[PDB]
Design a protein around this ligand. Structure first.
Ligand SMILES: O=C(O)[C@@](O)(COP(=O)(O)O)[C@H](O)[C@H](O)COP(=O)(O)O
Ligand SMILES: O=C(O)[C@@](O)(COP(=O)(O)O)[C@H](O)[C@H](O)COP(=O)(O)O
Ligand SMILES: O=C(O)[C@@](O)(COP(=O)(O)O)[C@H](O)[C@H](O)COP(=O)(O)O
Ligand SMILES: [Mg+2]
Ligand SMILES: [Mg+2]
Lengths: 123, 464, 464, 123, 154
């Protein structure tokens, strides 16, 4: 029997409960996204790794959800490899950034996917 | 008027059996599965169902001449034999728009299912489907929020949302409830919730439970760094009581409340959906009492209708069944209505029990919830049958884990991420299912503990 | 606590089957008629029904040790074979008081009927009766007024109250609705009413209907010199809507409103009863949708329970059936729940379907209403079966008379006063029925006209 | 295509988006101000370099707008150079201050101009 | 200005929708000034005294871009709101950059003005100059360089 620790296990939604994704593994993801028609997009954050509630507490309001867009959604791209590139490209420049990869379904307007591509040091 | 008033009885057939009829795009159509009484021609049974459902009674009344039944009469425009079935048919009835109060499922239900199910001339009646026209759909608010906004709010994408019903059903204290909540949530569940009969009782009062589960979910969200929520049950005995509770949840900043739509009722639900909309709470619908109506294939109302009705009155989530767990429910049918719950347009598909094309003219879709007697070993199936746009709930399956809630949570969260990646890498949750969680059981101590425990459990029993 | 937490499934039987059990005076008791699935021992079925109805789930959860299930567990204290019946039994379950939220039928139903009807292990489940303890009865308001104050208010003694449903069902304009109303009431009917599906529609809007029916009942009351009333349907799509209509009836000073409790919902009904109580409006309950739940002898809820549920929620009138007319209903059963509806104490009598002694500790009683496909020739029977404390309604039976409403009203008033005196002189409504009205038909022109028209009609068809 | 940095780009309203104003450049400003009839004034702040909202959040309320007046608005002055002086004068004494220059239109009562004359170290 | 508004759209002169310069100058003053003397030149047929009613901030919007900066700044003055719909979400590197583009463009115009340059004569170099020093600003310039909405007015 073991006590799930109460202390350095901050999560990042989808896939954050499996072991660190290998680049191959990560590749599978961008691959899937693609397979489906989602436009891949990147957003990084260097200051508020997690939601807060400083400006408001009404129901549904949480500060810290929005992240910074890395360049633009790569519409038309089909090179899984090219987005991966980008990830590399951003840890260079924002080494302390948390970087994530998302997938837009433009017909439904929902982010059909999202998985963290890179935590900064000590996360 | 026109044609003298001639007092006296006449068969229904004469006015409500209209095979001639050409449905209007604004008509409400209904597929009733009728089983008459011995000497009753189907077209009479069929005409009674349509008459006594719209404009007519059992004898001739002069007043008809004051208006015009051609405009108002409900009409049986076709019967069909139920292949390989005991004098059982499909009577199709069409109801002109003018007959229904806008915005009101209550009204719609009062008409279509008001009195006809007890006719002496019928021995059993069952409504299978209703075609809601766009002209009627546009008069409803529908879900406070729907799938996309819910995701957008909680910031959660790609994979089923996970949840757990605290147990025991009744008997836990305000405080234990909180404890249990926090413990399940920090583990990695997205939501915990009140059992559908946890309202406000001598053992635990709603205001006490609400205050402590708020404390707890807030603790669990800070800890994990992932938005959490606990469904707080607002079902009450009076609308005033009901709103009053929803109002507190709002005071606390919590994100979702819950309501037993059938025991509460459509009139009360509709009110809560409006209150949620204006106040920004997500509302979880629980379908208690439903199987009282939707089980027997020969009498009652089919769930696909109950489900439609809710996307109309209001709800962000609705319990859709599990196929694979403790309560009844077949796969094809479920698939059918789940599309009725989430899609914009659903094409007619008798295979799956959908008798009419449903166009929802952009009414928000509702997130189906898979709950009841399901565990770790079902993960890949649920994942398969339902897709990411679903909520999967672990009651027994969370508080039932050998090391307690936190661990029991972690087990499920891994089981599912596991299945999700298998899927994404291209594995086949249906064939390859079993290895996948089996595989993951190996790398996860909490997942393992789980696997061992519920390995041999299934709820195979020949369905109704 | 005590006894190590030992994870895993176990049969329901181990905790919810307690034939040992001695029911407490404050326990809710329920007689369910269960039909298991082939390999399910009744005592397991029965315990599943009791566990999944009170405190347990399908596997073992440590939290139970936090509280004490001996205090809270729902328990199956006996099974009985349904003599001469297909593996069908009467599981009897007992629910401790502590489990139900005071004043809430919503909560009671959520528990007793929430989920058990869809268990895979069962194939059919039906609730036949519920024993409400005085400790729980006392937590309800009950009817806004009840039999005595309603007669006291309307000033009406010694005979059934007479009423009529305006027809056509849907389609008449506000104005025509009033005309029809005035005409029926001036004739001698006590009441007229909205058809359960007349709410607020394009053809006729609620406030216009209410305004003209007031004008009309006021006309007829003045004319005849007898207090008149028109049931104004407050059934709406939101509680706010509902209250809002109730509030205008109050503004016009009219004496009674009406509500479809089942399509509306217990939550909304209770709120209306309260409002009616505080503003002194009598409330007429229309049980639309009920036959979807109460028809089949093997699955569902029995009306006697629906009937009970309302006397708790609140209603001054409830439709009780006719035995003799257009919809299903048998005499003994009926007599059975009619006593459950009006009397203070009702002794158990399996003959009549009453499975438990019901003590109402002075909750007011509700006036049963006999309606649907009844005419002049049924008078003596109805009078017989129901007695003075009933409302007998003539829809078709009134607007279908060859000389219109007024005369058709007169027709029924005479027929009934006819039967009442026959009765009082000592004639025998059951043997002597037929001559009595037959004799009257001879002296009354309006009555005559009626007799001739419905002479040959009856609705005999072998019951379900 | 380049990712406008999300991190050390705190602004200071008018002009803070052009390259650091040279003294010449700065001089043009005080010059313009004067050209117009505006009373130049100075204000420095050593602790809350940016607006906040600690005491209230109603609409329009922001804590952090008011800054300390440096001496008095120099009414009647016509020596662009004298105000400049002042600037120098204040960094002397409040090296860690943010110092700003504003111009009062007394007829309309509106600050017709405002441009930071000196950020402290590392801004 | 009688009913209530803090901002009012006043037109652009130079962009996608109709509007002539003088007339515009005329009502812009009617929106912000305390007293406005009659000037049939500018379409004002009567002297208008607002006895201190607060003035409204005119807003310049619709079909305007980086290359219109100097004119708008010219025609409107500091007390104006200038809006970039397309001109912002239409920038090759997305919104932020587009923002930055317009900001520099405008601060650019503002200093030139303050240095004494002539937004009207000297317009074009001014932004042209700045496109040189600003990456975001440049990206802009390149894309909307050839665009104007000259068409004979109504
Ligand atoms: O109370 C229960 O029995 C559950 O809460 C699950 O607890 P477990 O997960 O421990 O069984 C049920 O899913 C829903 O409440 C049953 O309904 P539905 O068919 O409508 O989902
Ligand atoms: O709508 C109707 O058909 C009635 O209005 C009667 O009209 P008629 O008198 O013209 O038939 C019915 O009695 C009740 O409404 C039927 O239900 P219940 O069995 O609940 O009494
Ligand atoms: O919707 C639009 O077209 C705008 O929003 C501009 O968007 P762009 O900046 O992308 O054109 C227009 O300024 C005003 O809305 C048009 O009117 P006005 O003449 O009154 O300002
Ligand atoms: Mg539940
Ligand atoms: Mg009716």
């Amino acid at each position: 029997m073991q006590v799930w620790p109460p202390i350095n296990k901050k999560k990042y939604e989808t896939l954050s409960y499996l072991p660190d994704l290998s680049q191959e593994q990560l590749l599978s993801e961008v691959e899937y996204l693609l397979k489906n028609g989602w436009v891949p997009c990147l957003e990084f954050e260097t200051e508020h790794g997690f939601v807060y509630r400083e400006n408001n507490k009404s129901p549904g309001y949480y500060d810290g959800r929005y992240w910074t867009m890395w360049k633009l959604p790569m519409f038309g791209c089909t090179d899984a490899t090219q987005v991966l590139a980008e990830v590399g490209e951003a840890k260079k420049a924002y080494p302390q950034a948390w970087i994530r990869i998302i997938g837009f379904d433009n017909v439904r307007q929902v982010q059909c996917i999202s998985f963290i591509a890179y935590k900064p040091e000590g996360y | 008027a026109s044609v003298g008033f001639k007092a006296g009885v006449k068969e229904y057939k004469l006015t409500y059996y209209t095979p001639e009829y050409q449905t209007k795009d604004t008509d409400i159509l209904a597929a009733f599965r009728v089983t008459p009484q011995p000497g009753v021609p189907p077209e009479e049974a069929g005409a009674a169902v349509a008459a006594e459902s719209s404009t007519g009674t059992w004898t001739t009344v002069w007043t008809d001449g004051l208006t015009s039944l051609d405009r108002y009469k409900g009409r049986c425009y076709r019967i069909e034999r139920v292949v390989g079935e005991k004098d059982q048919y499909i009577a199709y009835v069409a109801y002109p728009l003018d007959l229904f109060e806008e915005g009101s499922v209550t009204n719609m239900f009062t008409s279509i299912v008001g009195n006809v199910f007890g006719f002496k001339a019928l021995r059993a009646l069952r409504l299978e489907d209703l075609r809601i026209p766009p002209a009627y759909v546009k008069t409803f608010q529908g879900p406070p929020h729907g799938i996309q906004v819910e995701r957008d709010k909680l910031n959660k994408y790609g994979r089923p949302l996970l949840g757990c019903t605290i147990k025991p059903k009744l008997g836990l204290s305000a405080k234990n409830y909180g404890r249990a909540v926090y413990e399940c949530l920090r583990g990695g569940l997205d939501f915990t919730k009140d059992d559908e009969n946890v309202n406000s009782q001598p053992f635990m009062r709603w205001r006490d439970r609400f205050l402590f589960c708020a404390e707890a979910l807030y603790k669990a969200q800070a800890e994990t760094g992932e938005i959490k929520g606990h469904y707080l049950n607002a079902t009450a005995g009076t609308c005033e009581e009901m709103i009053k509770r929803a109002v507190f949840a709002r005071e606390l900043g919590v994100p979702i409340v819950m309501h037993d739509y059938l025991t509460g009722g459509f009139t009360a639900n509709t009110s809560l959906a409006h209150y949620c909309r204006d106040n920004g709470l997500l509302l979880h619908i629980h379908r208690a009492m439903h199987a009282v109506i939707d089980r027997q294939k020969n009498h009652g109302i089919h769930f696909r209708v109950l489900a439609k009705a809710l996307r109309m009155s209001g709800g962000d989530h609705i319990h859709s069944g599990t196929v694979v767990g403790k309560l009844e429910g077949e796969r094809d049918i479920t698939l059918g209505f789940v599309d009725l719950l989430r899609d914009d347009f659903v094409e007619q598909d008798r295979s799956r029990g959908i008798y009419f094309t449903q166009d929802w003219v952009s009414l928000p879709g509702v997130l189906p919830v898979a709950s009841g007697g399901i565990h770790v070993w079902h993960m890949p199936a649920l994942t398969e049958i339902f897709g990411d746009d679903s909520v999967l709930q672990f009651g027994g399956g969370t508080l039932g884990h050998p090391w307690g809630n936190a661990p029991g949570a972690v087990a499920n969260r891994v089981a599912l991420e596991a299945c999700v990646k298998a899927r994404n890498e291209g594995r086949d949750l249906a064939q390859e299912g079993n290895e996948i969680i089996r595989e993951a059981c190996k790398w996860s101590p909490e997942l393992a503990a789980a696997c061992e425990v519920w390995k041999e459990i299934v709820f195979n029993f020949a369905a109704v």
